[model samples]
Target chain A: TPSDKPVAHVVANPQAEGQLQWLNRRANALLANGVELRDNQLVVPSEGLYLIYSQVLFKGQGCPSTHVLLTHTISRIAVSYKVNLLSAIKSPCQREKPWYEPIYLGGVFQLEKGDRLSAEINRPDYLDFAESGQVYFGIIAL
Target chain B: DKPVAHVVANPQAEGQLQWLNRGVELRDNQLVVPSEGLYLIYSQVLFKGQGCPSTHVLLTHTISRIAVSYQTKVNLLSAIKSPCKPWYEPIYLGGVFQLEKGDRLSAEINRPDYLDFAESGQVYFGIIAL
Candidate 1:
């Protein structure tokens, strides 16, 4: 009998899987928005903040998962793609974070089936949302 | 033509990017490249329930100036529950991030229609620029 190659029993990377499922769902929802996944990018105009929404659902037996991640700027908002300014790492678009902060806006938000989380973005700063860009909505299971 | 950017959330401690985390949500992060170059960063943080929750930030090998910052809510819309639910309050614990810039964010005890209670939380933020 061949000895089992030090197969380490690894805990599943749930967050990665959740992100993958989000991508799959985004591709599937393309038809609803009337755009190809390739050209499904929604560009936010220079002016005004756009509302982007996301939803995480549990099929069954899922733990009482709480959503504490609301940092990403939504790539889609029922229709357009906007830049997530917070993700900036360049000149002009780059930000100057104040030293010593206050408190947080929200926390420990719970989400389940038919539930959604939204991020408002003006874009322009994060990246160029041209005619089409492959933007994504990512989440993790905690 | 103008500029472009990309971000990756590192859930594991790979060590490469900056940290821009709020109580849990990431307010915003900053990264500087020597010149316009295509970069990929993986950021991650792990959260545990109860007081003194620990937040870990991981980054990649990009030798450049980086800063991460966010603010906490100065005021609450409604009264908050003290000694509140799990994952309620989080303090900024020092990490391996190089000290270029930083901040914190403010938030409230949120529930998905009062369903899943977040005893703990985390975020993955990365950046690539050209």
Candidate 2:
């Protein structure tokens, strides 16, 4: 098991949502074991510091008296550059009864290979594509 | 610049956050890992509770790494929080392991009023030395 650099990867549970793309491994988009999934973004296989992360699982069936704010955006583009948000977290869920909101944003960054990551949700159908890995994304090249 | 511990709602503001603790000296609350190998410990537990947890269970967020050369206490990560809808949020634990050098990291939460400390970073705890 000659392993040293394959950082990490845990793409999406595809089906469709809004923005935030890069989930291949059900039919092979190739994004894990060293990261690389171009056309859908997330291709930073060998850089320096990278502990990037994302987790957005927002569900609801009954919960909204007043609070239900959800805005999870973690982007990083570098073909033309300029989309860096790195970490954006928001959750104001408080109504009760069948409501699950998961918005996590991670830290540690400094890439330089190709640099193209994505994960967005301004409140599009309250996410949860249903495939697995809990609507996730990944990176861990440190 | 290893040894960074900050989880403030206003522990005197400490300049808002970034309690490196002057070389991991964050005493009592425990976060003493001044010279380890791989460390990427992170924390954010801002679960505003008052509902939920009827029979949902599993809202644990842990990060324990107390290895005083082998006194033993290693639970690198455990972000067990889910399925319990109705309002059960904020329990973020980060990754990266292997530490040693008076290593004694700490962050525990089984249930502490669900947590909502308040200097407004919601909730935070840090460690970076990867």
Q: Write the per-residue lDDT of candidate 2 for residues A1-142, one digit (tens) a residue.
A: 2225445444455555555566555421224456677676677856688777776666666666565678777778875674756656545454444455566677778887777777667776777654333455556665
TM-score of chain B of 1: 0.23
State the lDDT of candidate 2 residue by residue for B31-100, as single tens digits: 7776745555677765555665566544555667667766755555444444453354666766544466
Q: Clashes in model 2: which pairs?
A: B9-B119
Alpha-carbon TM-score of each model against the true structure: 0.19, 0.33
Best-matching candidate per TM-score:
2
Q: How close is candidate 2 to the true structure, as a TM-score?
A: 0.33
| Runs of candidate 1 exceeding 4 Å displacement | A1-142, B1-32, B38-42, B51-126
TM-score of chain A of each: 0.22, 0.34
Residue A130 C-alpha lDDT in model 1: 20
* Total backbone collisions for each predicted model: 38, 1
Candidate 2 lDDT (Cα, 0 to 1) = 0.59
Candidate 1 lDDT tens digits, B21-120: 3311244444332233222223223333344223321111111222233232221011111121344323221111112123221222232122112322
